[model samples]
Target chain A: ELDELWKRVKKLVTELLEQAERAGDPEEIFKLLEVAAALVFLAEMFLRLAAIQEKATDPEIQELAERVLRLIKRLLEEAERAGDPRRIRELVEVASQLAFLLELFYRLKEIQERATDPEIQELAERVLRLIKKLLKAAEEAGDPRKIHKLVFVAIVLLFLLQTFYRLKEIQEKATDPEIQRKAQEVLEKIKRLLEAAERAGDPAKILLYVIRALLLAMELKFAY
Target chain B: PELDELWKRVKKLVTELLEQAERAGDPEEIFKLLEVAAALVFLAEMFLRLAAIQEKATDPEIQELAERVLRLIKRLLEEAERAGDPRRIRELVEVASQLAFLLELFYRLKEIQERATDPEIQELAERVLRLIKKLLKAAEEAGDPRKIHKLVFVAIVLLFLLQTFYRLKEIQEKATDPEIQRKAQEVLEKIKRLLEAAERAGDPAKILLYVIRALLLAMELKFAYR
Candidate 1:
């Protein structure tokens, strides 16, 4: 059982490493990098090691322990490297990089095309047009990072639009005027939250609050 | 000796604030009284520290500093009692007591340092003394209200971190799924590392940012998973 657990932990660690590489954009990778996975792996390894450290008889367990020890060292090194100041700077720039926005644009476009609702499709088109302009201005400015930041801002704005769309959908289906009024109030609050997120100087702070709003939107979606 | 006169003025303000509260009709007057009350708390704590060091130094000039400050605070308590406004008095007392407790800890540490011969103990004391001095200097330069407000804010943050850690531990224990438990345990370690990093960080704002980020991560871990 312990040996099997070690194998699972190692698999998870390997998966996170692959995810980090697949992300390509260091900023996106690090921002999306969930250290919780690594932590889970390490904890599992420790428990297995504790179990086997006393028995010291099973060759398979011993081998698994060795593999885990090696993998942990590698993971720690990778984690430290990922957190390197230079790497972090690379990530910070990724938020405003032209290639990054291009990737996001195509992704949003994919969402737009696949959506069944006319309202959702229109919302996507509106955002897509704005991104087209932003991409052009970024191309002319010779510094995509600064303009990309605006593009990222647009992405958040689009996210709010989707949230409002969900709220409107609920409002249409609901018979109660009270429900509609509450939805309107939530929409207003969402606008203020969006403004605050944009006005926030620290990108991390903006992401934090925006993510919270996104969570609240998901809650409301589930509620309806 | 200079601190003795400072103590008297603080004592006078304490009495004024207490007495004025009874006759006060305006909300502005109540605000002014609270402001004065905050100042008195700060001064009383300062005198207590000085008195502690003077007692150790066996200095006669500062012998009655603590006693004098206590007398003033006692008078304020009496006046507050006579005024019969428990709500206002309670608020004032809470701030004063919390600051007093904090200052008492500072003085106790200082006293231990002064008497300590071991180099390691002395070094720790020196660092703590420097911290207290830095906070004192910063508070002095920032004027008054913000300094007091910031101290309370810092205290609240520290308390919040402790609660966060406790909650993580609780989550780990309650979690039935091994995966969730492992994740919870890891988050707790991450928070500890983040706090250590903040301490090592040169900039004050850097720590605050790290704390805020950790808080966000903690929120996600708790809510998203639950």
Candidate 2:
């Protein structure tokens, strides 16, 4: 019954969003946004409030995440089919962000003890790259001629890069003293990733490529 | 703007102080600064997080700045203790207000994220929320938020980060075996992303969870590494 209620609430939130676009009255927009936000919050809180690792493992998170993703994707398709590019992009970004986040948790859950394990390290690196890519695709959706529009993209990029650098420093410490040669090679690959960011013609392009590599890295790591 | 400036200053001062401690082999002053600097970050986050609770927080890209502050603090405290500086104990106390404030303000930012409409932001927010829960569990089990907050957490977390770094660097150095090197580097980069998520977490509780989760993952990946 509670699950049924949640399903209803989720549908209502989606309805509110669709209605808000058509309503256009300032008061109505505000009211809908308010409701949407509140419902989303409540839904999340209830779902997570009692969540435990044993019960809320990867499959569970992934299952919930997929449901959310499916809804977002469905919404995006509806919006696009109805000629709402802006809304479609906005929704797509949201889905990508959510996926990026789930993977972030998944990746962390994956590499905890074997911080030195090449496979885990590589998987983590790939996820970071994926996030960067997703954000890039997100940027293209923004009004590029407007400088302020791309500002968020730029900030997120710097944010990811700095964080990645810090990780590199830690990896340096984890290297086996006997494996200097192997470690140096890994560093060079990182250099290439960094260089890809620097050499890309457009800043957004740079972000996309790096994020792609990051995601690829994550996918490959998980695969093996 | 003022808070931003202050944060930048604290980060710089602590980083420099850390460098000083390492160079001088006299970690006392560095440890003191680490404690103080960390406390300041926590305090800053507390203030910001409070504003967030009241729906008055700034419109930053990230939601849980306070959690991030705590993570950095945990990182520094661990670094200091790993260096075995006694000043950590005193300094941690000196900035007790900030630490408490950080603790208090944690839940609010998390609440905001859970309520977020942006799926991506919300997703990350949920992960952070889970991470926070894990940290709280660890703290309870460890029986000392202060001690865990101080150094043990950071040392272990940093060690994890360092392990990833070491592999990537080694892979780079051994590029002749391009296959093996590329493989190793990829794992290092993936860990780098995970590490950043932890660093950017706004609360100590959340960060502790992230670190613990990372540690768990490490165990799984290197089950054969011993």
Best by TM-score: 1
**Hey, what RMSD does candidate 2 come out at?**
24.6
Worst 10 residues of 2 chain A by lDDT: A215-224
Q: Deviation in angstroms for A88 in model 2?
A: 55
Tell me the spans in candidate 1 whose CA falls farther than 4 Å from its real position.
Answer: A1-224, B1-15, B31-152, B220-226
Query: What TM-score does structure 2 among the candidates reach?
Result: 0.23
Alpha-carbon error at A108 in model 1, in Å? 52
* Residue A62 displacement in candidate 1 (angstroms): 57
Error of 2 at B134 (Å): 27
**TM per prediction:** 0.28, 0.23
Residues B42-92, model 2: lDDT tens digits: 344344444444345533423344445455445444444454455654544
lDDT tens digits by residue: candidate 2, A55-106: 4343433444344344434433453454443453455344333333333344
Tell the DockQ for candidate 1. Answer: 0.01
Candidate 1 local lDDT, B189-223, one digit each (tens): 78767766755654433443454445545544564
**What tens digits encode model 1's per-residue C-alpha lDDT throughout A23-141?**
66644444333342323324322433443444433333234334334433433444435645344333323321222223233333334334444644544344344434433443344
True contacts kept of each: 0.00, 0.00
